[PDB]
């Protein structure tokens, strides 16, 4: 059961979407892109959660997530005073109208920040950090290493026989103070963004099946949905499976010359299958790699030209610009196939913005508040006062406002372009009933 | 034309001096004092690699960025009387980002091959490292410039698309075919850059 | 020391039940469809987000590179 | 010799970024304001 | 054992990342301010909305600040050159990328401000086009960040 | 002084932020006497775990001093917005 | 000895400074008086 | 043995071939697209006939790809330099020749569309001229293919 | 043991920071003053507000003075060269960034000041935009201060 | 017995010959096609005669192909250098001379084609002048053929 | 132990300090004088007030004169090079900074005087703006003095 | 024991001083004569007073002659180089400074003389401004005299 527009009273009706005090804002950001086709699947019920989630990934900051909610709460607490007043300031009105959107966005931002364990670059210690056993580090032929340590860092080895075990929840806090967090955690977020982006696209495509059923267009799935989803699954879902496989299949025991999923993915597409010199993820992978790419090609004829071909077949038997229809379908096929590749890149914004934010938080902390601390008691305390006040100011000016606004826009971009374009198609008319709008006049 | 005159004067003097110096080295029968092999070997492959990487990413976004505002201005202007334009003609910008994406992917894949040498005296050191260095430089340059010019093309074409659609909604779809060629041109550069670095090793 | 199996069981059950059984335990008001959508959409997105974070850190190839002062401190902290 | 490895490599990177600076400055200098405003 | 001059390339990276980004953001700001001043006379109610291109340009300036500081905090004396070229590439990569971004911001914003005042339905499109340029600038930042660990 | 009730209210919010965050910082070091490990250590750090406990106590002291200043600032701003 | 250093320095220092003068002279040479007010009548 | 740096020139060839051919195709394509859009507003019935110039441009792009791929696959470390110079020449030959051809493609297609816009009978003539530009692109490709095999 | 002529880079830094910052402030000052002279003849009551661009231009100049002095007081004879590279980077970072800001100040000042006379509600909008240009200048100062003591 | 890199000059010859000739033919073709498209609208019946300048341009392109191939066949590794200079001279001689000829072909065709439409008696004069341009192109071919076999 | 040629840099400094500041003051003087002539025809009563930018221009030239002399009185054959670089930087700092101020002086004087001709209330605002240009000139002098005495 | 060709720099000084001074005076003379020729048609009675800009302009050429000869008087073969640098700097200082003054004289003379006929009260202001340009030229002479004798 999906939400669809209401019937209006054999002409194309306007699109009527019932909204309430909370969901109205979400419908508007959908309508800002366009008015949906009559009886189209309304994306808004999914936006209510999907968009805050994409923001929370882009804005995965536990500390700012709280501040963000508090801002929204302030507006809600004055809800009765703001509504029953004059509001000539349109920017205030807009954020007020979106106050329930902002609150939710903060709610998920806290969730994601908590798992990332970053609250103004602060980790969340649950007493579960057991990544390594330092006492055993020194036993492993490291005697008085802290003397040389004065000029070195020294990276903690994997599988020394004494380390291991995951952090109970989220990323082990120890990475928050590491010099190589920029490879361990950056890689994870890279893979996460790809996985989430692909899933989101597949969801949007799955919704197209329901739309194809509602309008009784069997052909739109026989040569559309089916070969399109086959293309995407065989290439993009396979990649996702490999990512999880790598995490679960190989340990540090093979870290040297460990298989690289990027290279295998490229070699997959190119049918490059070296006999030796590069370790494979699993035996027979080359056969699977070749199989999937060939099948992806085999589905293309359906999506590329068979739709106008069968329409010509059925048309002439029942009796349509065949050439023009070929042009339309060929362009559509290119957009879908090429767009999936491009769209995957689009969802790298989740990584790019999450990283960019993390860089702002780490640098803003380190180069502002950290320097305000000093071994001298009174000077340190008083310095923290003035430095913190400026620090909090910068956190608001840079992250809570500007970056929160950027992540808002970028997550909204993903909704409009990559998600909606899989099922939310066509246009409708504005629903404008008679109403007693002139209440104040 | 004050700036064009400056650019020309510098251009002419730059090459005119090179001609005089080059011919003089020949005339005075210098022992190949200007040794190209020397320049290529002393110049660290690290610069060539990192330069090509920066070019691959930097040139590609410049192209996209160029085309975006070319088509942005046309859309915004025309859209005053035809607001429908934003519904469909935004795809021209998608093509522009897509050209940047082509280069962006290669820029990362190429940079993923960058490694230290622990090398000193080039004599019999890094034979393969010089090949890989120059190849990475070329591949980066190849894709960078190719995407640069593609982005300009797509912008010019998208501008016509917006101006056409404002007056006749039936023209949009047919025109899309031209931008697709523009994108294909950039992909061709990607194919070559892939081949150029298909068999390289660093370190 | 921790195993991965237990974290997965605890949080997988939590979000699974919410996304599967949750819809059965929902107010019957006009927003029921929205609340059910919330319960299911939230559980799926939240579970997957977390699952990657905890799964991705299994079988690590390397540990953190720490500054000297921290390395010493941990000896007597963890 | 006239040039060292160091000097030459430095000049090569200097010119590349100088061209970037020139490009940016070029378009910045070729920037005009309005002669008059449309209306009150 | 460190090739001399090795630190020279690195320092230039931090500088370029900031300077080129400021040039881009400044260009976009200058272009927007011109269009804003002309538009706002007839429709002052749009003055607040018209700032967006400028805020976006400001983001470009931050993009550059992040790399310039990241590199600066990564400079040492005994630089092994390999690291230095990575820093120089990072600086140049984000610099030119931000510069181009800022130009797109400025040019589009100027037209967008006038177009929106004449046709408010163009407001969303204005933001969208600027949004794509900001995304392109982000790429410039990310690649500069990636090089820091290579 | 009036200063404007809009700015007094902002000061109250910053003052509350300051007192809450600074006290929290001191506590975290006092309990884990820690991942952050940012007490402003010396470079010539010796093999003395007691030095970490001692510096962490110093951080708590300094943080509470900063909070005390935010308590004074919040008090003053409180009366301004109330009287305005 | 160290010719390459003095050479590099003097060449590029004097070249940049010489150009700064050349451009400044150009800009001064072509100062626009406005060609108005009284110029139209003298012309 | 095989000296260092010898591959440098062959890399420049492979890169030049692709870039200059891309330049040619991009110019011819952008110019043709401009003329086509301008015509189609006045009369859409000629649009299909006016497409060929755009493909003609793409051909220059392929020309360049064919050689750039041929060289790029031929590139190795142990290059005897002679082969690199042949690659350099082949790369430049096809790229720069395709550039000239693509320019002609652009100018002739753009003018051709305006000509046909007024008089459709010009179609065949305009295509024949573009055939000469395709021949110019071929000649470049021919020489480049010959050089790569020496 | 220290490389010779190592002071050259640091000295160029101190001078570069001051000169480029003066160039930026000078442009913004000259452009704003032109708008002020053209504006205030009609609206003399605004003469004491239209100076702001010019004041903010002076900030760019100070930003440069602070670093240029900071660098000069940091120079000695036996410089290890490394430090000199940092000094030049800091000098250029603030100078060229201030230059970019100076352009923003100038263009925005002119457009804003004249626009303000046409529409006084623009006054605040002008300041906000000019505030963004000042923030862009600040970023350069921040990096220069980070490098100059690194 | 021969010096290294001696083959460099030869490959530059073969490439230069083809590239300049394509540039010449391309210019003449582009200008001729523009004039043809503009003229034929008023006088469509002349479309089958006004093509000639374009053929003349193709001759410049062949001129280049002939020498470029003739040089290419003479390219070896053990080149005596002397021969390479002759090959480079031959390549440049025909290419640059054909470039000059193609320019004239373009300008003369452009003016002549339109002049012919307004004056049918010009047809003979136009062809004669184009014959002179072909003669100018041949002179380059003659010298290049002499040098390549010297 | 003294590097030969070392004194070359210090001498160029003494010259640059005067030459660049002279170019600035000359520009400001000529630019203001032109506006003054225009004013006086409209109204001569202000002729003794519009001279100020010109007098101020002279102050900037003095700035340069002072440093150029201070450097000249600090030149020696047995120069330690370190001091030579400081003198070069000091000369450039004041010269180029005064140059920027000189152009600023001329532009604002011309605009201010021409405006004042129509609006006498503009005089006070003009003075303040000219004061900012004088402040910009001083900053260069200050740094140059700091460097020359370092 | 002196370096070879040490006089080279001093000789360039003597020449440069005369050449740049003639350039300055010539520019001012050409512009002043142009304004005089245009002016005196309307008011021939001012043809005599209007010459002053040209007479003042000659003072520049004199300055150059004085220094150029002063340097020539001190040219020998056994020059310690240091003395040669001083001579070159002094020559450039007065020459290029005189060039700046020449611009000022010419621009002010043109506008001033023409303005004077339109406004006889401008005469005194014109003279005063020209006096400032003469002072700017003298500053060059002063530095050259101090520097060339150091």
UniProtKB/Swiss-Prot annotation, chain A:
Vacuolar side: 60-61, 124-187, 247-291, 359-379
Topology of the protein relative to the lipid bilayer: Multi-pass membrane protein
Top-rank lineage group of the source organism: Eukaryota
Pfam families: V_ATPase_I
GO molecular-function term, one example from the UniProt record: proton-transporting ATPase activity, rotational mechanism
Cellular compartments annotated: Cytoplasmic vesicle, Clathrin-coated vesicle membrane; Cytoplasmic vesicle, Secretory vesicle, Synaptic vesicle membrane; Melanosome
InterPro entries linked: V-ATPase_116kDa_su (IPR002490), V-type_ATPase_116kDa_su_euka (IPR026028)
Gene Ontology terms: cellular component: clathrin-coated vesicle membrane; cytoplasm; melanosome; membrane; perinuclear region of cytoplasm; plasma membrane; synaptic vesicle membrane; terminal bouton
Gene Ontology biological process terms, A to Z: regulation of macroautophagy; synaptic vesicle lumen acidification; vacuolar acidification
Residue(s) carrying Phosphothreonine: 12
Residues the record lists as Phosphotyrosine modifications: 16
UniProt keyword terms in alphabetical order: Cytoplasmic vesicle, Hydrogen ion transport, Ion transport, Membrane, Phosphoprotein, Synapse, Transmembrane, Transmembrane helix, Transport
Official protein name in the record: V-type proton ATPase 116 kDa subunit a 1
Species this chain originates from: Rattus norvegicus
UniProtKB/Swiss-Prot annotation, chain C:
Stretches that traverse the bilayer: 6-26, 34-54
Gene Ontology molecular function, alphabetical: proton-transporting ATPase activity, rotational mechanism
Protein's name in the database: V-type proton ATPase subunit e 2
Gene: Atp6v0e2
Any one biological process term the GO annotation gives: proton transmembrane transport
Record's function text: Subunit of the V0 complex of vacuolar(H+)-ATPase (V-ATPase), a multisubunit enzyme composed of a peripheral complex (V1) that hydrolyzes ATP and a membrane integral complex (V0) that translocates protons. V-ATPase is responsible for acidifying and maintaining the pH of intracellular compartments and in some cell types, is targeted to the plasma membrane, where it is responsible for acidifying the extracellular environment.
Residue numbers on the Lumenal membrane side: 1-5, 55-78
Family: Belongs to the V-ATPase e1/e2 subunit family.
Topology class, membrane: Multi-pass membrane protein
Top-rank lineage group of the source organism: Eukaryota
GO cellular component, one term: synaptic vesicle membrane
Cytoplasmic compartment residues: 27-33
Cellular localisation: Membrane; Cytoplasmic vesicle, Clathrin-coated vesicle membrane; Cytoplasmic vesicle, Secretory vesicle, Synaptic vesicle membrane
Organism: Rattus norvegicus
Protein keywords: Cytoplasmic vesicle, Glycoprotein, Hydrogen ion transport, Ion transport, Membrane, Synapse, Transmembrane, Transmembrane helix, Transport
Glycosylated position list: 68
InterPro entries named among the record's database cross-references: ATPase_V0-cplx_e1/e2_su, ATPase_V0-cplx_e1/e2_su_met
Swiss-Prot record, chain D:
Post-translational modifications: N-glycosylated.
Annotated protein name in UniProt: V-type proton ATPase subunit S1
Record-stated family: Belongs to the vacuolar ATPase subunit S1 family.
Superkingdom of the source species: Eukaryota
Transmembrane annotation, as ranges: 1-21
Cellular location(s): Endoplasmic reticulum membrane; Endoplasmic reticulum-Golgi intermediate compartment membrane; Cytoplasmic vesicle, Secretory vesicle, Synaptic vesicle membrane; Cytoplasmic vesicle, Clathrin-coated vesicle membrane
The protein's assembly and partners: Accessory component of the multisubunit proton-transporting vacuolar (V)-ATPase protein pump. Interacts (via N-terminus) with ATP6AP2 (via N-terminus). Interacts with RNASEK. Interacts with TMEM106B (via C-terminus).
Portion of the full-length sequence here: 413 to 452 of 463
Cytoplasmic topological domain: 22-40
Tissue specificity comment: Expressed in brain (at protein level).
Function field: Accessory subunit of the proton-transporting vacuolar (V)-ATPase protein pump, which is required for luminal acidification of secretory vesicles. Guides the V-type ATPase into specialized subcellular compartments, such as neuroendocrine regulated secretory vesicles or the ruffled border of the osteoclast, thereby regulating its activity. Involved in membrane trafficking and Ca(2+)-dependent membrane fusion. May play a role in the assembly of the V-type ATPase complex.
Swiss-Prot record, chain G:
Disulfide bridge map: none
Membrane-spanning segments: 3-23
Domain of life: Eukaryota
Cytoplasmic side stretches: 24-43
Record-given protein name: Renin receptor cytoplasmic fragment
Protein's gene: Atp6ap2
Residue range from the parent sequence: 301 to 343 of 350
